[PDB]
Write a protein that binds this ligand. Sequence first.
Ligand SMILES: [Mg+2]
Ligand SMILES: [Mg+2]
Ligand SMILES: [Mg+2]
Ligand SMILES: [Mg+2]
Lengths: 245, 245
Amino acid sequence: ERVLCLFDVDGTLTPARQKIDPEVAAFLQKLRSRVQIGVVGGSDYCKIAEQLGDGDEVIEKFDYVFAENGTVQYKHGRLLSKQTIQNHLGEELLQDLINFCLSYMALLRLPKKRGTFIEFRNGMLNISPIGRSCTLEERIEFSELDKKEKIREKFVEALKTEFAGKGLRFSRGGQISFDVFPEGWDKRYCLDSLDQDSFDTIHFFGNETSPGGNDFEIFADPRTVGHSVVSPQDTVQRCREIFFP
Amino acid sequence: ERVLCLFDVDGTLTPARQKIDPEVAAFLQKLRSRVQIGVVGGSDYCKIAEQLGDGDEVIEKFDYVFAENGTVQYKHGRLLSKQTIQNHLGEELLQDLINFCLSYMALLRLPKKRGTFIEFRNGMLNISPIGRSCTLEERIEFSELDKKEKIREKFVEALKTEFAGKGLRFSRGGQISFDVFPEGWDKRYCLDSLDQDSFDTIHFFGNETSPGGNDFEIFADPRTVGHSVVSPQDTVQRCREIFFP
Ligand SMILES: [Mg+2]
Ligand SMILES: [Mg+2]
Ligand SMILES: [Mg+2]
Ligand SMILES: [Mg+2]
């Protein structure tokens, strides 16, 4: 009867990369009268906060905010966190990765390039092979080129092969980029800390719980009761069925 | 009798990369009763604003704020600006530059690396060969390694040679990085817009007016009355001598 509902963000509580519907927001606070509620996303904290409230309201609206798959953690209004990838991987492997990426991208000759090809985050390296778009027009242009030439896809194939067996994982940063993160640093990462918070049950909700999806591992983990949803309205209905029948 | 005093920031009005002394700030507003006053820096606007006031006060405290050597311009409280390097250089040369940098850095094997090796700004590309430090400790560590191995210095020599005659310039980003910018996009850039604002005299003050220094060109330009200073106290004294004798 100490219960947590933990939600993926994009596609689960909000439209992808966009603001939460106020009616969903309002339900979550109603759900909060029965259970603790938390979010876990691949995005950084700034992005997640932006989608879920104004300023830093998200840490007040939710009992847990797990950004970068849980490598960044807010707990009951306070920053508990955090871990760094360089600490976990070690400098040698990290630099092997980086120099392989640098060398690969140097040989890519595209219509055009921008900057910040490799960004250090807490939970991952975000790799943007064409560079980060400066406008929406460039972002769309880059997306289309990536689809036609399979830029990110082919880069990841080369990376996975080069680092076979060395414990690196690769996932989409949506369009434009992909993340590189240590094995185990998918959404499951947040479960290790949650393990110590004495929940009787942890319900996880996500919209990519199929194999390949960025919710799969946390959905499938024996530490959670898993729920697959297709939309924020689906999520709200499932919560009503389980907690307010 | 329409006069502008235009100041470099770092070392001229403030300690390098640091906040302005309130007593200097106070004098500048007194000087403002006689002349218009402006700043021009290599840094981005956020950095300059941070050194000269709280929030966006700098655009209120100064009649002109020229960031990134004038490629970004605030004029009497409003953003007038701005120009982009990609527009000026063209995509082909830009990508030649970028891929040369990527390829060069890929072959650098250091004690360690971080991220954001190439950052797109308005007035330049900021190149950080070891990556951007995550802490003060890493920043100092990187500075020392750069001094011993001449990392930035040797990278610039290779770059200048490769792009000989093609109109690129290179200058220090302090420690850790160097800027690449188009010929003419040093501090003089801001003079072109100022040319149209009907000043009878434009007095420029800087602390790197010697050849090699990032104030040299604007100091030497026939559009300004040039002044060399060594400290923010030197600057204030010179203004007192010229305007309040
Ligand atoms: Mg999702
Ligand atoms: Mg489960
Ligand atoms: Mg200076
Ligand atoms: Mg002059």
